[PDB]
Design a protein around this ligand. Structure first.
Ligand code: NAD
Ligand code: NAD
Ligand code: NAD
Ligand code: NAD
Lengths: 233, 214, 211, 214
């Protein structure tokens, strides 16, 4: 059982399809589901929850439903995220906070909750946080985004230490520019990379597969940068 | 004119005495004032953003705007993560990240409108570079702050607004055989705000007795 | 074809085993050989490297993939660490990766062919330790070098990445790392699934660098 | 007494004026001397480690042990990496990394022997934190030097020997509209050797006008 946030789009949605193909049971979290409706009509082992991850009450109601339905996820993938592009002086309090509530607070809460159940059961859990190269190098017009992505890397490290004794591994992936719904400008992207190729969702999906695998037994608290050389210098 | 949050204790408090004694006009922000000349002391809960907005309404009525922001208000939970509630996680984030962001946006706005230089110094921590147990919020919030620092340094650089951070160690795991003291952090602030710091922006100054070395 | 330095021991030897088993033409380089082209070479000798490349230019053998795993760790108080012991660690741990990396990249650029280099660094490339001045300098240098060479050769599809093993209490996890944790990472990093990965350093360390 | 490599040019040079003018006895170390009061000038190739060992034998016989060491001698190749030869890479390493290693071990030996409380500053670079085109040896050497700073800080910390580095940017890819000047490096050196730097070691001070910010 693998629980994936941001399931309606981009990376999270490429994960939904990939992991259903390899016979995982998938719990999909997203605030929209227009791009999951078709799959909901099938008999695939797919539980879709509609949920505003910025509402921490709704996150409890999620865990109430999972407990009552007897779903303990084995893996959590925190991919849901938002990103502002607005001058910092135009960025309102609420919207700074929204970006924080989705990108940082929600991963923390979902992580505390799955980890509570894993601790209680002696299960060997796995968590992957999708941060960003904005968690390492800043960008203009992105105060909250950079802040939130730096915070999530930090959080990954902290929570790896908190739960390592229980063999719950917690890692992050920091994508560079990946072509999804979230994303002249193209030549600027390339001029800031080393590779002349576009980042795709499959590059992140593959990294997740590596990091949830048995081969990743000794991997915790690390940040895997998947960015075509953006952070190189 | 320097604005200092966390003025009622430790690093912020030590900054009060020191810049008053250097002849600065001081605006002191803290939720407590028991521990508190050109000194405006404000009793304020900095996790309440409505109260930061009202502070600025008062400051604009007073035609009083800071040249310098020191974000030293801060809280550290010590709680096992399973016992760290939603609200406490968020409170730590609202004090340690959201309040520096709001205070910084606000003083940046007025520096940009007045076309005046400005300087912000953010008090982070070594917990911004290295995690520790029982510190989910503290660590995430301090990391976030370091990232906030670099971001706003980039945002405002062209307008000559410098934004830097300091990451103190503790004020065995150290390299030096001495205690970190408040004055070690004050001296670095003094440096970061000075004319000698004209070319320093987006930098994190670690003052930690070798704690982060290895 | 894959070239692996440090082939006689630990991480390098584990790779020889795995990549034969996977059908690769392996080229092992090492000073010792007591444990497939096997070359006995001291990599701290720059003219031996140039000769290996001479020989290899005559045999048609230029690797598709390079794995710099040859390394030595002094454990020496820094006051007793001689000039020559310091240069040697630097010559093996840094200079040789660079010479070996420049040489394969030369042939890849000429042939207009993709290449892949994985540099075995260390968590000592990120966090210092006492009594390891050369080692820590050298592994910090190699992380630097990986990023620089990732930039240098990106637009020729030459990918350059590194791995920072922990030890193969100061960790988060209660197990010991194994040469296979590092081999599995090298495998991932040379895969077609790593098309987008360059300049990155992969930490594989049980949480050692976490905090 | 302050020992300064690279004393003939740029940052080492500007340190010569500066610390002479503040009453330090200075030992200038460089391979050239055309741009060079209690001053001892040594013409020395810092890539030749026999000569270094010589200098210190001599200095011991003159009972001159420096109190402070500034490692500023440096070289940057700008050369495409396919044209960077073995010798060229080794030379950059020998100057930028090996020499500061040796000079540092040599002055620490004497501080430990005499029970002095010494101070070392390493002049690294933003290329110690970020790669650039055509700078394989420079980038590797400068990353090496940050790493050595942390390690020797850890080694000699029980002996109150502080080891720190500074990472100059350029002395558009910056956030500030401005050039670094040697003085920005010199003031930072002055701060790191001071009594207010008592709790500072292992640290890396970036002075780059936002280059590394993102
Ligand atoms: N695409 C990129 O270039 C890129 C690069 C680096 C990092 N990232 C990060 O990767 C992750 C996914 O990015 P993507 O490109 O797939 O984005 P995307 O916008 O295509 O999809 C993100 C999904 O998150 C969901 N989400 C947002 N807010 C939510 C809420 N409050 N409750 C529930 N769901 C919510 C969205 O609705 C969406 O379906 C994010 O964490 C993002 O910051 C993306
Ligand atoms: N002392 C250390 O070991 C250490 C180390 C690294 C970083 N720090 C950081 O340095 C800064 C100052 O720490 P300190 O040791 O001086 O702490 P302290 O507890 O002595 O002082 C912090 C002050 O912040 C104030 N504060 C907390 N919440 C507030 C709110 N909601 N509104 C207004 N004020 C509030 C407190 O009332 C207190 O006066 C903080 O950012 C802290 O995280 C401290
Ligand atoms: N095992 C660990 O805990 C660990 C941790 C971090 C990094 N590393 C690094 O991984 C790499 C391999 O590690 P290992 O555990 O396999 O060490 P090892 O001693 O088991 O293997 C090193 C190999 O490198 C070869 N080598 C050393 N000097 C040489 C020279 N001058 N010329 C040619 N070959 C030479 C040795 O002969 C040996 O076969 C090294 O770069 C090392 O620094 C290891
Ligand atoms: N200027 C910048 O923008 C900048 C940026 C980042 C880092 N740095 C670093 O700052 C330090 C000083 O830089 P600078 O700009 O003053 O450089 P520079 O070239 O102006 O001066 C360096 C000096 O080191 C000396 N030197 C070189 N090789 C020597 C040898 N083998 N023996 C003795 N002396 C030798 C040279 O003769 C020269 O006088 C260096 O370590 C450099 O890498 C400078």
């Amino acid at each position: 059982i693998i629980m994936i946030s941001g399931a309606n789009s981009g990376i999270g949605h490429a994960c939904i399809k990939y992991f259903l193909e390899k016979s995982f049971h998938v719990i999909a979290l997203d605030i929209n589901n227009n791009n999951l409706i078709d799959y909901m009509k099938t008999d695939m082992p797919l539980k879709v929850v509609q949920i505003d991850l910025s509402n921490s009450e709704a996150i409890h109601n999620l865990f109430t439903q999972l407990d009552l339905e007897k779903l303990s996820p084995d893996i959590l993938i925190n991919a849901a995220g938002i990103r502002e592009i607005t001058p910092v002086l135009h960025l309102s309090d609420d919207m700074f906070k929204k970006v924080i509530d989705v990108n940082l607070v929600a991963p923390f809460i979902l992580s505390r909750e799955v980890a509570k159940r894993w601790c209680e059961s002696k299960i060997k859990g796995c968590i992957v946080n999708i941060a960003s190269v904005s968690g390492l190098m800043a960008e203009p017009e992105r105060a909250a985004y950079v802040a939130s992505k730096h915070a999530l890397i930090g959080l990954t490290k902290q929570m790896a230490m908190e739960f390592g004794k229980q063999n719950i591994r917690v890692n992050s992936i920091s994508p560079g520019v990946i072509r999804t719904e979230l994303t002249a400008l193209m030549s600027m992207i390339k001029s800031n990379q080393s590779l002349d190729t576009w980042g795709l969702p499959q590059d992140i999906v593959s990294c997740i597969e590596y990091l949830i695998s048995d081969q990743a037994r000794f991997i915790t608290g690390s940040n895997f940068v998947i960015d075509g050389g953006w952070t190189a210098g």
